Nucleic acid binder design. Structure first.
Ligand SMILES: [Mg+2]
Lengths: 167, 128, 231, 59, 33, 493, 350, 64
RNA sequence: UGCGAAAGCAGUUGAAGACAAGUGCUUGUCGUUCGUUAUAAAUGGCCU
C-alpha cells in the first residue's frame, strides 16, 4: 500500500580536503557560458544562467552505474566535454571512476564508464590545458603526501594510463 | 516547506526542489554587520517554534532572545511571540503583532498549537 | 524618407549610431528612450524601443566585440552617475555600471564616453574599454564587460574632448592610443597598452576654445572593424 | 548653435562642397550626425526630434 | 503533508516521502547553420 | 547582497488609553477663536453649498461667517425682537428665520437688504423654521402655539397643512431623508410625533416616547432617527418603532445635535451632541454610538454644528454658549529657448515597447547616531545619545543597540569625569521610568566596575552617585508598594 | 508600405523566400515557415543572407525550384541587369548565372522541369535549360507590346503553349511562334496569372479588386471573384478547391469552391491579425494546401513570423490575436518586483 | 567580499553576504562572473553551504 | 561535561613527544599523539 522513495535533493558537494584551498568548488560553467553544472551529494544539477531555473537533473538513483558507484565516493572534479573523444561532461570521483555523461538531453543508461589504476591512492584533483591531463592524488604526523601523475587515454586499449611525474 | 533556521525562516519548494525565500524573523545583529573575534560569541535570537493556522493565512513564531555576556542582565532570557500574515500572492510575511514575555517573565513557551477550524474559524492558538 | 517618421521622437536627438554590420540605427535623447530603427530608405519602421526611467540620454553607441562577432551591446549614458549596457525579445537584458572602484571623486557623471578595443598584449586577448571624462583632466578607462577599473589618464586643465586611434604593429597586434585635448589646445597621446603612459605632446596651432577632436581614414567608433586584420 | 549649421568637406582637397547643403534643405539645429559603415548614408538629427536621411550616390 | 503522503527529512538533508526526403535534410542543414 | 536594515526604534508594550485613529483626526481641530456675542447664541446652521458659510442666531441678529476668513460677512438686523433660527434652503440661496413676534422672514442669503417673503405664522413665538430637504418650495414652521404649520413659498396666505396634537411647546422639527412625505416633530411632552404629509394629516401616524422633554430630533439615516432629550439621547428605528440604542454619558441636558457622514475622516459618520455641561462629544454610529472624542467649554453649550460633508476646504467645528461666547475650531486643509532645449523630461514612456525602471526609492535621511553605529563609531554613538533636545525614545535605542551589539565596555573606555557626566545625568532621569530602568541598571553597573578608582578622586561624580543612590532607593519603595497592592488584589479575587 | 519587396513560398509550403533592402543593398533570405520540424527540433531564425553587391541591382522576380525535383534546394532570381541567377540556399551562394545577350530587366520567369522561360522589357521570350546551362532560342512575337507576366501551361510533361499578359492576356504556341487566343484582360497591368486547373486560369491586375477566371480552351470569363480591397498575392488549393488572396489592406480572404449571382462571387472567409493592444498587423503572403492555411506577418521591422491554422473550422470573420511588446514592464530574472536582488534575504521590519 | 586593486592598493566591497566567504574565484574568459562559496556559520549543527554566482558588471547574484 | 527549570545539583581541566627562547637547567609553544563525559593585541570596521 505504502512505499518509500526519495524526492528532493540535498546539500551541495564540496572538495572536503583540508589541504586544498581555493579549489573547494567543483561546479563548472559551460564553455558557451549558458549553464552551470553543480554536483550535489545525491545528484548533479544543470541550471540555466539566463533564466535562473533548473533545466536538468541527473539523479544517481535512476541510473544503474551511478546508483552502484555513489550509493563513500564523491566527485573530485568535472571536466567539460569528454577526454576520450557537444553536451558531454566527464566526472572524476575520489576512488578513480571516470564517467562520461550528457546533459541537455536524456541520460544514457550505459555511460562510457572507465577506471583509472591507482595503488592505495585517493585521487584529489585533475586538470588540463590543451589535450594534456595531470592528476594529483594523496598517499600516506597527520599530514598527507601528494603525487602528480600524467594521464592519457590510449585508443587501442581504451584505458587510462598513469605515468609518474612528481612527488 | 518552512525551515526554522537560526534567527530566520527558509522557505523551500520540494516539488521543484529549490529555495524560494529566506526571511529574518528576529531582531539582533543578523545582517547589520559581520561578527568578528569577540562579537562572534554573541548569540542571535533563536526561533524555537513555528506554526501555521489551519486556514494558512496566519504564522505564529516563538523566539528566545539571549542577553549578552558579562552584564548584570546576562541571565534573564527574553521570550517573544509574534503573529505574521500574508496574502497568497505575496512572498514576504508581514509582522502583525508582537508579545514580549508572554505568560510572565523568563517563563518559556514550550508548546504552540494552532486552533482547529471550528473555533474562531482557525484564527486562534494555544500556548503552553 | 526620414528615419523617424515611423515613430517620432519627443525630445532632441542627442546621439545617433549605425550598427557595425546590420542595417540598424539607434537614437536617443532627453526623452529617456532608446529607439532602434530599420533603415531601408523607403519605410524605416521601428524595430524596438526601450524606456529608461530617469536616465536622460546624452550619448549612445552600438558595440560589437572584436573577437566574438556574435556579441552585440548598446552603451548609453547621461547626466547621471551610472552607465547602462544592453546585451542583444520578450525582455531586455540591461546592466547598470555604477561603481568606479575608489575613483568616485574624479567622475561625477558619465555623460561623455567612448568605446574602443584594447589588446592585452601579454595574453593577446582583446576586450572592450569604456572611456570616460573626469573632473579636472581625468580620463577613466573601464573594462567594458566586467566594469572593472583598468587605468586612468590625466591632462592639465579642463578636458574638453578626446578620440581613439589604433596603430597596427604586426599580424594580430595593434595598440590603442588615446588622444585628449585641453581647452587651450594642448594635445596629449596616451598609450593604453602600456598603462596609460604619455607618448607625445603637441599643440594645435592657433587653438583656443577647442571643443571636439576626431580622427578618420581608418578604424574608429563610426567605422568599426570586424576582425584584427581590418584595423 | 544656429539652424542649418552643417557643411561637408572633401578631403584631401579641403574644399567645401558648394551644391549641398542649400538654403532650402531641412536640417534645423543639427545636433547629431552619423555615417553608415557602408552605402554612404547620412543621418542628421535636429532639436525637433527628426532624423533626416540622405544618400551619397558615390558609395 | 496534508494529502495522503508523509514527508521525512534525513540528516543528509534529503526529503523522502512515504505514501500510497529532401525537405527533411534541408531542415537539418538549415538548423545546423 | 542586501541593503542594510534600518535601526528599529524601541517600542515598549502598549499602555492604556492609547491614541486612537478617531482621536488623531479630531485633535486636528486646533486653531481656536472665541468670539463674544450680546446674548446666548440659540441656533447654528451651515450653508449646504460652497463656500459653506455658517449662520448664527443671537439676540435680534443673524451673522454669517465666511468659511475661510472666519469673520462676519453679512448681518441681518431687521428683526425687531429675538431671532430663533437661520436654516438655509437645500440650494443655499435663501435663509429663513423666526421671531418672538411670530413672523417668519425669508431673506436672500448674501443679500441682507432684500426680503423675499414675510409670513405671519402665528401670534406666539416661532422657534423653529426649516426648509424641506427633498422639496425646495415647502417651508415648515413650528410655534409655541403647538401647531407645526407647513408653509409654501408660492402661497404664503394659508398653510398647505397644519399639523397639531402636541400638548406642549414644539421646538424640534425633522424631515426624514428619502421619505419626503414624512415629517417628524418633537415636543416637551416627551413624545416624538411622526406625521405623513401625503395623507390628510393633523393626527400623528404614531408617537415614540422619549420620557423627557425633547430638545432636538435629527434623522441620522433614512431608517434611523436620533433624538436628544433630557440627560440622554436615544436612536429610534421607524420600521420597528423601537429604540436601538441609548447613551447617558452626558450630565446636563443635551440641547442640540448634528450629524455628518462621508467625510475624509477615519470614522465614516459622526454624531456631535451638545451637553449644556460645557461638553460637546462625538459618537460613532457604526459602533453602536460609542464616544470617541470630546471638548470642554467655559459655559453650557446651546448649539453645535460641523461643516457639511462636501466642505471643499478647511473644516469647521462650531459651538454656541449661553454666555454668548462662540467657539470656532478649524481643521485647515525658465525661458522658452531653454525649455525647447530640454523637452523630454515630461515623457513617461506611454508609447514605448519596453519600460525599464531601476531607480531605488529614496529612503529617509538617517540620523547622526545611526550613522555612527553603521560606521562602527561606538563611543560617538554614545555621545550622540545624550544631546540636548533628543527625544527620549530615540536615546533609549542607541543604548539598546550598543548593548545588543555587545559593545558596552567598548563605548565606555576612553572617558573621564568631564565626559561621563552626561551619561549619568540621563541615567539620573532614566532610572525613574519603567521602560529604561533595566537598561540604566545595566550601564550604571559597568561604569562603576570600570571607573571605581576615578570616582574616588573626582568629587563631582561622588555627588552624582549619592543623588542616584537616593532615587534608586526611592524607586525601590515605589516598586515595593506596587507589590503590596498586587498582593492586596489577589486577596480580593 | 511594406519592407518585404517580394516574397514567395516553396511548392511544399514549408519555406519562404523574401527580399528586403539593407541600407542601399538588397538581401535575400529563406526561412522555415513551420514552427517545428518533423523530427521535433524547433525551427530557428536563419541569419544567413545573400547580399547584392551593387546598389543599382534589384531582384525583379523570384521562383522556387521544386525541392523534390532537384537534389539541391534552389531558388531562381530574375534581376534588373538582364541576367538570371540560380541560388542554392545551403551554400548561400549563387551557383550559376544565366545571362541573356541583351541588358533589359526580366519581367517574369517560370519553370517546368528543365524548361526555364523569361521575358524582358524588350518583349523578347527566351528559353533555358537548367542541366545544360544554355540559351536555346530567343524570339519576339508580333502584337505583344508589353509582357508583364508569363506562365507556362501545365500540359503533360512538356511546354506546348504559354500564357503571357499585359493589359490584355494572350496564349502563344512555342512551335508556331504565334498567338492562339486573346482574352479581354484588365484595364491596369496584369499582376497575377496563375493557372488553377486545366482550361481555367485566374487573372488579377494592379490596383484592382476583381479577379477574372478565364477558360483556356474557349475564352469566356467563367466568373469574377471580388475582394474587399486590392489584391497583392495569390495562392490556390489543390484543384480549385479554395483560393487565398492577400489583400493590400493587410487582410487575407478565402474563396471556397470558386469554380462551382453565380457570375460575381465574393470571398467567404476573411482573416485578419490584430495585436493585444489594438494595432493591426498586415499580412504579406499566404499558402493553402489542403486544409491548413499559413499566414505570414512582419514583426519588428523585417523579422517574419508564421502561423498555421485550419480554415475549415474558422468562422467567417476571424481575427488572430498576437502578443506584441507594448508598455511591457521589464522583469529581470535576477530581481523581484521591487528591484531587490533575489538572493538577498528579506530584512526584519517591525 | 573585498576586491583589492593592487595598482593603487585601493579596494571595492560587496558586503552583507548571506554567510562568510569560504571561497572566491573569477570564472570567465574576461572575468564576467565571480563564483563564491558561503558557509552560514550561524547553524553550528551542520555546515550549510550556499554557492553564489555574481555578475561582475554590477555585482548582483546571477545564480544562487 | 552529565542531569535538569530558566534556577541549579554533581564533576572535570591528566600524560607523553617535539620545537623555540633564555641560561645539561628554566619558561613558552603545538595544521603531534594517548587518555577522561569533559584574555586579546600586524593601526587592522561593511560599496555605488
Ligand atoms: Mg531662419
Amino acid at each position: 500500500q505504502y512505499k518509500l522513495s526519495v524526492v528532493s535533493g540535498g546539500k551541495p558537494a564540496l572538495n572536503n580536503l583540508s589541504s586544498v584551498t581555493g579549489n573547494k568548488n567543483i561546479a563548472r560553467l559551460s564553455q558557451d557560458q549558458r549553464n552551470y553544472i553543480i554536483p550535489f551529494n545525491n545528484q548533479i544539477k544543470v541550471y540555466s544562467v539566463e533564466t535562473r531555473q533548473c533545466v536538468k537533473t541527473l539523479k544517481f538513483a535512476n541510473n544503474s552505474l551511478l546508483s552502484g558507484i555513489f550509493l563513500n565516493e564523491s566527485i573530485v572534479k568535472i571536466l567539460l566535454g569528454d577526454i576520450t573523444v557537444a553536451h558531454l561532461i566527464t566526472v572524476f570521483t575520489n576512488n578513480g571512476h571516470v564517467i562520461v555523461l550528457n546533459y541537455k538531453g536524456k541520460l544514457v543508461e550505459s555511460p562510457k564508464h572507465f577506471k583509472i589504476s591507482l595503488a592505495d591512492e585517493k585521487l584529489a584533483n585533475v586538470f588540463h590545458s590543451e589535450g594534456n591531463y595531470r592528476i594529483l592524488t594523496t598517499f600516506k604526523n597527520s599530514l598527507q603526501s601528494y603525487r602528480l601523475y600524467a594521464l592519457t587515454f590510449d585508443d587501442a586499449k581504451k584505458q587510462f594510463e598513469v605515468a609518474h611525474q612528481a612527488e | 516547506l518552512y525551515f526554522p533556521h537560526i534567527s530566520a525562516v527558509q522557505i523551500f519548494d520540494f516539488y521543484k526542489n529549490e529555495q524560494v525565500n529566506y526571511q529574518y524573523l528576529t531582531s539582533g545583529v543578523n545582517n547589520s554587520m559581520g561578527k568578528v573575534r569577540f562579537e562572534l560569541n554573541l548569540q542571535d535570537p533563536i526561533i524555537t517554534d513555528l506554526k501555521f493556522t489551519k486556514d494558512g493565512q496566519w504564522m505564529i513564531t516563538y523566539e528566545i532572545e539571549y542577553p549578552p555576556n558579562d552584564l548584570l542582565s546576562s541571565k534573564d532570557l527574553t521570550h517573544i511571540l509574534k503573529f505574521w500574515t500574508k496574502n497568497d500572492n505575496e512572498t514576504n510575511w508581514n509582522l502583525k503583532t508582537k508579545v514580549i514575555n508572554p505568560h510572565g517573565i523568563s517563563v518559556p513557551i514550550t508548546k504552540i498549537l494552532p486552533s482547529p477550524r471550528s473555533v474562531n474559524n482557525s484564527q486562534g492558538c494555544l500556548t503552553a | 524618407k526620414d528615419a523617424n517618421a515611423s515613430h517620432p521622437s519627443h525630445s532632441a536627438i542627442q546621439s545617433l549610431s549605425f550598427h557595425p554590420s546590420k542595417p540598424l540605427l539607434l537614437t536617443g535623447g532627453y526623452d529617456k528612450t532608446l529607439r532602434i530603427y530599420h533603415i531601408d530608405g523607403k519605410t524605416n519602421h521601428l524595430v524596438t524601443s526601450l524606456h529608461l526611467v530617469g536616465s536622460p540620454i546624452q550619448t549612445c553607441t552600438f558595440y560589437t566585440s572584436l573577437s566574438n562577432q556574435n556579441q552585440q551591446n548598446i552603451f548609453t549614458a547621461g547626466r547621471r552617475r551610472y552607465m547602462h549596457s544592453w546585451d542583444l525579445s520578450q525582455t531586455a537584458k540591461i546592466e547598470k555600471f555604477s561603481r568606479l572602484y575608489g575613483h568616485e571623486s574624479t567622475q561625477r557623471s558619465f555623460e561623455n564616453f567612448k568605446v574602443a578595443h584594447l589588446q592585452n598584449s601579454q595574453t593577446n586577448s582583446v576586450h572592450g574599454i569604456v572611456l570616460l571624462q573626469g573632473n579636472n583632466g581625468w580620463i577613466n578607462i573601464l573594462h567594458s564587460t566586467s566594469g572593472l577599473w583598468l587605468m586612468g589618464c590625466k591632462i592639465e586643465g579642463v578636458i574638453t574632448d578626446f578620440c581613439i586611434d589604433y596603430q597596427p604593429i604586426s599580424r594580430g597586434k595593434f595598440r590603442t592610443i588615446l588622444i585628449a585635448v585641453n581647452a587651450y589646445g594642448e594635445v596629449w597621446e596616451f598609450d593604453l597598452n602600456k598603462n596609460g603612459h604619455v607618448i607625445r605632446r603637441w599643440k594645435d596651432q592657433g587653438g583656443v576654445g577647442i571643443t571636439k577632436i576626431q580622427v578618420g581614414g581608418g578604424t574608429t567608433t563610426t567605422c568599426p572593424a570586424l576582425q584584427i586584420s581590418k584595423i | 548653435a544656429v539652424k542649418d549649421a552643417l557643411r561637408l568637406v572633401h578631403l584631401p582637397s579641403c574644399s567645401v562642397f558648394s551644391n549641398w547643403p542649400t538654403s532650402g534643405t531641412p536640417l534645423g539645429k543639427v545636433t547629431s550626425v552619423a555615417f553608415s559603415p557602408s552605402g554612404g548614408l547620412l543621418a542628421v538629427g535636429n532639436e525637433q526630434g527628426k532624423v533626416r536621411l540622405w544618400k551619397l550616390n558615390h558609395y | 503533508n496534508y494529502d495522503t503522503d508523509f514527508i521525512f527529512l534525513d540528516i543528509e538533508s534529503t526529503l523522502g516521502v512515504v505514501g500510497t526526403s529532401n525537405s527533411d535534410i534541408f531542415a537539418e542543414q538549415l538548423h545546423k547553420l | 547582497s542586501t541593503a542594510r536594515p534600518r535601526i528599529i526604534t524601541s517600542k515598549a508594550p502598549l499602555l492604556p488609553q492609547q491614541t486612537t485613529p478617531e482621536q488623531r483626526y479630531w485633535r486636528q481641530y486646533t486653531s481656536a477663536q472665541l468670539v463674544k456675542e450680546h446674548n446666548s447664541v440659540t441656533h447654528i446652521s451651515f450653508n449646504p453649498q460652497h463656500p459653506h458659510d455658517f449662520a448664527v442666531t443671537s439676540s435680534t441678529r443673524v451673522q454669517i461667517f465666511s468659511s475661510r476668513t472666519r469673520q462676519v460677512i453679512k448681518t441681518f438686523s431687521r428683526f425687531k425682537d429675538v431671532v430663533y433660527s437661520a436654516s438655509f434652503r437645500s440650494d443655499g440661496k435663501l435663509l429663513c428665520a423666526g421671531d418672538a413676534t411670530g413672523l417668519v422672514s425669508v431673506y436672500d442669503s448674501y443679500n441682507p437688504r432684500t426680503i423675499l417673503l414675510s409670513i405671519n405664522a402665528s401670534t406666539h413665538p416661532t422657534h423653529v423654521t426649516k426648509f424641506h430637504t427633498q422639496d425646495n418650495k415647502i417651508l415648515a414652521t413650528a410655534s409655541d402655539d403647538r401647531v407645526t404649520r407647513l408653509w409654501d413659498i408660492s402661497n404664503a396666505y394659508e398653510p398647505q397643512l397644519e399639523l397639531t396634537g402636541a400638548t406642549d411647546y414644539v421646538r424640534t422639527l425633522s424631515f426624514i431623508p428619502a421619505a419626503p412625505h414624512l415629517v417628524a416633530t418633537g415636543s416637551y411632552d416627551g413624545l416624538i410625533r411622526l406625521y405623513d404629509t401625503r395623507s390628510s394629516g393633523s393626527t400623528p401616524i404614531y408617537s415614540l416616547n422619549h420620557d423627557q422633554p425633547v430638545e432636538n430630533v435629527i434623522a441620522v439615516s433614512p431608517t434611523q432617527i436620533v433624538s436628544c432629550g433630557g440627560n440622554n439621547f436615544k436612536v429610534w428605528d421607524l420600521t420597528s418603532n423601537k429604540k436601538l440604542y441609548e447613551r447617558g454619558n452626558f450630565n446636563k441636558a443635551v440641547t442640540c445635535l448634528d450629524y455628518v457622514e462621508n467625510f475624509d475622516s477615519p470614522m465614516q459618520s459622526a454624531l456631535i451632541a451638545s451637553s449644556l455641561d460645557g461638553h460637546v462629544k462625538v459618537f460613532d454610529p457604526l459602533d453602536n454610538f460609542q464616544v470617541k472624542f470630546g471638548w470642554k467649554f467655559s459655559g453650557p453649550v446651546l448649539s453645535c454644528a460641523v461643516s457639511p460633508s462636501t466642505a471643499q476646504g478647511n473644516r469647521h467645528l462650531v459651538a454656541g454658549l449661553s454666555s454668548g461666547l462662540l467657539a470656532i475650531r478649524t481643521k485647515k486643509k525658465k525661458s522658452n529657448n531653454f525649455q525647447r532645449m530640454m523637452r523630454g523630461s515630461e515623457y513617461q514612456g506611454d508609447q514605448e515597447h519596453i519600460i525599464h525602471n531601476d531607480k531605488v526609492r529614496s529612503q529617509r535621511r538617517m540620523r547622526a547616531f545611526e550613522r555612527n553605529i553603521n560606521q562602527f563609531k561606538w563611543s560617538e554613538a554614545l555621545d550622540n545619545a545624550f544631546v540636548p533636545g533628543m527625544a527620549k525614545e530615540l536615546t533609549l535605542t542607541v543604548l539598546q543597540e550598543l548593548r545588543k551589539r555587545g559593545k558596552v565596555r567598548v563605548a565606555l573606555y576612553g572617558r573621564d569625569e568631564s565626559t561621563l557626566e552626561p551619561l549619568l545625568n540621563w541615567c539620573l532621569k532614566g532610572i525613574e521610568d519603567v521602560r529604561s530602568a533595566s537598561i540604566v541598571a545595566d550601564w550604571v553597573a559597568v561604569v562603576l566596575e570600570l571607573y571605581g578608582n576615578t570616582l574616588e578622586s573626582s568629587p563631582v561624580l561622588q555627588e552624582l552617585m549619592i543623588d542616584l543612590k537616593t532615587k534608586v532607593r526611592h524607586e525601590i519603595h515605589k516598586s515595593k508598594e506596587a507589590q503590596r497592592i498586587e498582593g492586596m488584589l489577589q486577596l480580593l479575587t | 508600405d511594406s519592407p518585404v519587396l517580394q516574397s514567395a513560398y516553396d511548392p511544399s509550403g514549408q519555406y519562404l523566400c523574401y527580399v528586403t533592402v539593407a541600407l542601399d543593398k538588397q538581401r535575400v533570405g529563406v526561412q522555415p515557415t513551420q514552427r517545428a520540424t518533423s523530427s521535433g527540433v524547433d525551427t530557428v531564425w536563419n541569419e544567413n543572407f545573400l547580399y547584392l553587391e551593387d546598389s543599382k541591382l534589384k531582384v525583379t522576380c523570384l521562383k522556387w525550384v521544386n525541392l523534390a525535383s532537384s537534389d539541391t534546394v534552389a531558388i531562381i532570381l530574375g534581376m534588373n541587369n538582364g541576367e538570371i541567377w540560380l541560388y542554392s540556399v545551403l551554400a548561400n551562394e549563387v551557383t550559376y548565372k544565366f545571362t541573356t545577350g541583351n541588358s533589359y530587366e526580366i519581367k517574369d520567369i517560370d519553370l517546368m522541369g528543365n524548361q526555364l522561360w523569361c521575358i524582358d522589357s524588350s518583349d523578347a521570350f527566351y528559353q533555358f535549360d537548367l542541366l545544360q546551362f544554355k540559351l536555346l532560342q530567343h524570339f519576339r512575337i508580333n502584337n505583344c507590346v508589353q509582357l508583364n507576366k508569363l506562365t507556362i501551361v501545365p500540359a503533360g510533361d512538356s511546354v506546348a503553349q504559354l500564357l503571357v499578359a499585359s493589359h490584355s492576356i494572350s496564349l502563344i504556341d512555342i512551335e508556331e511562334k504565334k498567338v492562339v487566343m486573346t482574352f479581354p484582360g484588365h484595364v491596369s497591368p496584369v499582376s497575377t496569372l496563375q493557372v488553377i486547373t486545366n482550361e481555367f486560369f485566374i487573372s488579377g491586375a494592379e490596383g484592382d479588386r476583381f479577379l477574372n477566371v478565364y477558360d483556356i480552351h474557349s475564352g469566356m470569363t467563367k466568373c469574377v471573384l471580388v475582394a474587399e480591397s486590392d489584391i497583392k498575392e495569390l495562392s490556390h488549393s489543390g484543384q480549385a478547391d479554395s483560393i487565398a488572396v492577400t489583400t493590400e489592406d493587410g487582410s487575407l480572404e478565402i474563396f471556397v469552391d470558386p469554380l462551382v449571382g453565380n457570375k460575381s462571387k465574393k470571398s467567404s472567409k476573411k482573416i485578419q491579425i490584430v495585436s493585444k493592444d489594438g494595432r493591426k498587423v498586415p499580412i504579406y503572403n499566404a499558402f493553402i494546401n489542403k486544409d491548413l492555411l499559413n499566414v505570414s506577418w512582419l514583426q519588428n521591422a523585417t523579422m517574419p513570423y508564421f502561423k498555421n491554422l485550419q480554415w475549415r473550422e474558422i468562422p467567417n470573420e476571424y481575427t488572430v490575436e498576437i502578443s506584441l511588446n507594448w508598455n511591457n514592464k521589464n522583469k529581470s530574472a535576477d530581481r523581484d518586483l521591487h528591484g531587490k536582488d533575489l538572493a538577498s534575504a528579506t530584512n526584519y521590519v517591525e | 567580499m573585498s576586491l583589492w586593486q593592487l595598482e593603487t592598493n585601493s579596494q571595492q566591497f560587496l558586503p552583507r553576504l548571506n554567510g562568510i566567504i569560504i571561497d572566491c574565484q573569477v570564472l570567465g574568459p574576461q572575468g564576467n562572473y565571480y563564483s563564491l562559496i558561503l558557509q552560514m556559520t550561524e547553524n553550528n549543527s551542520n555546515s550549510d553551504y550556499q554557492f553564489l554566482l555574481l555578475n561582475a558588471s554590477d555585482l548582483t547574484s546571477k545564480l544562487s
